[PDB]
Amino acid sequence: VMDLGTTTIVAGQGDFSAYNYGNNGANWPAPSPAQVGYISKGQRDVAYVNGDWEKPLLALWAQWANWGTTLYGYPSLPFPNYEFIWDIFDLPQADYNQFSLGDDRITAMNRAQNHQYPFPNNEGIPSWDRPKIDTFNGGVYTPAAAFAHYLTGKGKKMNFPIERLNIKPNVKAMPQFIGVLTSSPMGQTTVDFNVPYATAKDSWVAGNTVGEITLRIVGILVKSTSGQWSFRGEIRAYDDLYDFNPSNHRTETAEGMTRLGREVGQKFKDTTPYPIGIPGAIPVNISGRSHH
Ligand SMILES: [Mg+2]
């Protein structure tokens, strides 16, 4: 499925199994901070399913780290630390459910959250080793999943398939291509050049995940004596380092995310950049003619 986070869906707390578990009084003999934790997942999930991922995480962290700043309307929690940790666990699984299983957003999150929630500890809870999660969906969970992998993936490579970036490069408008088109000999020429590309121009998800990447344009150009020309080839992309680059932050919460990035390693001691492969090719088949 190609749910690349372009559409907005309608969701409420009651769409999420974890919230429902928290809100079922039959489950809870007494008042409980664990019950409160389950309830809290509902409103965060509502945000997540539409890609509003910075605010829920920032609200948790701001509590944990005593920033004394805005909680973005979220309730203060008994253990905002435990909820931040579990969301970091759940978010990449939700993203992977979309990619691997073609789950819709809500199903993907409920599937991801269909597990026990013991208190996280310093003895292997949660279990971060999940080598099967190796490719991003390119949708509403992808930026959060990429951040989670920064915190806990221990340097392992992730793949963002090029077609899931949702980019729409205009080769004819690239100055390098225009240059090649004018400077190439008559007849058939091999074309191969590199160009930086701001993915945010095309795709909020890509922009908030990989940001600027380097494309490679490769193919065969033919310039005919009639003035006609054609180019057939493809666009590929080089691996791109995920290092939580502030250039990629969405404006509204950029200050908060920058602060988070500077502090998160205090608590997530394995935080480290990792390569994002951007495998595959986008076909190019274009043509035109000289203006003279
Ligand atoms: Mg980049």
Task: Concatenate the DSSP letters of all residues of 104-161 into one string.
Answer: -HHHHHHHHT-S--PPP-SSS-S----TT--B--SSTTHHHHHHHHHHHSTT--EE--
d(CA 212, ligand 1 centre) in Å: 4
User: Resolution limit in angstroms?
Assistant: 1.7
- Distance, CA of 166 to CA of 136 (rounded, Å): 13
Does 161 sit behind a cis peptide bond, omega within 30 degrees of 0 on the bond before it?
A: no
Q: Are 172 and 286 in contact (CB under 8 A)?
A: yes
Report residues near ion ligand 1: CB below 5 Å: 210-212, 240
Interval between CA 230 and ligand 1 midpoint (Å): 31
Closest residue by Cα to residue 115 from 50, 15, 21: 21
Amino acid (1-letter code) at residue 112: A
- Mapping DSSP to helix (H, G, I), strand (E, B) and coil, where does residue 50 land? coil
Residue pointed to by tokens 């003279």: 292
Token readout for 42 is 């509902």
The full set of domains in the chain, from first to last, is 1-157 (1.20.1440.280), 159-292 (3.30.450.400)
Q: 32 φ, ψ to 5°?
A: -150, 135
Q: d(Cα 290, Cα 174) in Å, to the nearest integer?
A: 16
Buried b (16+ CB within 10 A) or exposed e, 113-144: beeebeebeeeeebebebeebbbbbbbbbbbb
Q: Strands 274-277, 282-289: parallel, antiparallel or unpaired by DSSP?
A: unpaired
The answer for residues whose C-beta is within 8 angstroms of residue 202's C-beta and 6 or more apart is 165, 166, 167, 168
Eight-state DSSP code of residue 215: E
CA of 64 to the centre of ligand 1 (A): 29
Residues placed in the known binding site for Mg(2+): 210, 212, 240
Whether 234 and 200 have beta carbons less than 8 Å apart is answered as no
